[PDB]
């Protein structure tokens, strides 16, 4: 549909492509967290460890509602188990306790919501493998504290599972203007930054309220708006009536980045590579210049130094070998 070849010749470079997803009413599950482990009712050599754990739990829970050698060893063994129980619990449900309202669920809590069965999780919630990945990296599966009990220590957490409705064939495309030279003068085109393409249909999108994700765009409602016939004609290929303003008395982007690749204007300013300090091979075949990590890991444009990417070595986690 879009004619990117004649758009590239007026400074517009293809950005990240993303498909359109609308968020419906989320499914809800109640994860009841019995915060007291099922200890034995036997009362020998337990003593005050139970009450110490109770006051430790009180310190956690009140702000939520508000807004003899062997005998000691048995106590110590049960003391550490309760701490391990709480530390494991405070890892699966730590963030929810820290922010009782609208905190994103840990991946362990999401797994515990279905007993570790991701095969069930995808089916009952009607998730494709992509939708779960998008929701995870958009941090959209949240949680809320709805009931705290200070007599029998347990808390129930809503875990909101958003329903990502995906458009039939709509892709959100990022259009990145870059300055280009024409008639021995520097120009820049003025087109919407994010576009909606679904078959022959092109519509404006007000993406600002949405969640931008590497694979898709999550929106709470459809933000598509009708296109003018002139703007569609530009995007179809007839760039002769596409907007373009001179760069005089203004600052304009002379480069754009896409999927780790730099598209540059090297006619207006000199572009070099800091790795070697020499100019980049340039041709009149294209009005814009392309640089990738393969050629230069760090390229300079005028005085703008740009890192195209660099993989440094791995490093081991450092800690004392206590055993």
């Amino acid at each position, epitope marked *: 549909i879009l004619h990117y070849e004649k758009l590239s010749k007026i400074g517009l470079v293809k950005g990240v492509t993303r498909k359109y997803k609308i968020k419906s009413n989320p499914l809800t599950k109640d994860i009841v967290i019995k915060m007291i482990p099922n200890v034995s009712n036997m009362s020998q050599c337990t003593g005050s460890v139970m009450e110490n754990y109770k006051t430790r739990l009180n310190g956690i829970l009140t702000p939520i509602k508000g807004a003899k050698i062997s005998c000691k060893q048995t106590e110590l063994s049960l003391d550490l188990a309760l701490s391990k129980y709480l530390s494991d619990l405070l890892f699966v449900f730590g963030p929810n306790l820290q922010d009782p309202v609208s905190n994103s669920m840990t991946i362990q809590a999401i797994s515990q919501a279905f007993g570790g069965n991701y095969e069930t999780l995808l089916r009952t919630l009607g998730y494709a493998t992509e939708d779960f990945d998008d929701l995870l990296e958009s941090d959209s599966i949240t949680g809320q504290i709805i009931y705290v009990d200070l007599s029998s220590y347990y808390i129930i957490v809503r875990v909101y599972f958003p329903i990502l409705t995906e458009i039939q064939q709509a892709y959100i495309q990022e259009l990145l203007p870059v300055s280009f030279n024409n008639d021995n003068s520097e120009w820049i085109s003025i087109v919407p930054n994010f576009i909606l393409v679904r078959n022959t249909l092109i519509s404006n999108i007000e993406i600002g309220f949405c969640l931008i994700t590497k694979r898709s765009v999550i929106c709470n409602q459809d933000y598509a708006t009708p296109m003018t016939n002139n703007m569609r004609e530009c995007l179809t290929g007839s760039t002769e009536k596409c907007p373009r303003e001179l760069v005089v008395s203004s600052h304009v982007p002379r480069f754009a980045l896409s999927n780790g690749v730099l598209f540059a204007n090297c006619i207006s300013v000199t572009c*070099q*590579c800091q*790795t*070697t*300090g*020499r*100019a*980049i*091979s*340039q041709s009149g075949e294209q009005t814009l210049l392309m640089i990738d990590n*393969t*050629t*230069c890991p760090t390229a300079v444009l005028g005085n703008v130094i740009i890192s195209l990417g660099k993989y440094l070595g791995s490093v081991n986690y450092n800690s004392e070998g206590i055993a």
Partner: antibody
Amino acid sequence: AVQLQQSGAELMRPGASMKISCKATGYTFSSYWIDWVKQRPGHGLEWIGEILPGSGDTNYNENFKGKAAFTADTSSNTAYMQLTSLTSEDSAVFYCARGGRYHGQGFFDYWGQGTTLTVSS
Amino acid sequence: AIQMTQSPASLSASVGETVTITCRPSENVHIYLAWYQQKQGKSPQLLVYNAKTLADGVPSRFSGSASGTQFSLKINSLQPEDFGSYYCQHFWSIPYTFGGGTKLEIK
């Protein structure tokens, strides 16, 4: 392209300075970098730096920042290099090489005929 | 600075033998690797300037190959004039690092 002739061998005392030359003909001199590469007689080849005659831009090696200084007389198609703080370790052969126009063209198409810098007491 | 590992330091091959010299940079240099031929009393001469492209005037007996880190230069039907020193050089980053050099001997 046709000739990259250098000035002949010369003798200087340690601690002095010297100026090498390279004459290039047969192409557009102002476009191609002239990179100087050093070769001690027994241990291989070593790079010094480069100079772009048409723009005056230069690049240098860390071991040769103070040891080298370039100059490109485009009016006579002659390159140059100044060497300072010469010692016995600076007595080697210095080669002028036609580097490429742009990045990714650091390979050396043509080389100088070869003259020996001789530093001794 | 990038370092260049070139092996072997010396290489012996007879007349009509097929011989190969390889070099490895300490870091990815892309196809940016060149091979030069040096003999006593003469300047090095460009043979293969990119990873796998022969220079102008180079005999077809010379050829090269490129890998992720491995770069090798292969000579087919070795002739007496093919003796001398072979250098492997990168132009990925400043400063450009030459290899250790290989002395080929005609047998």
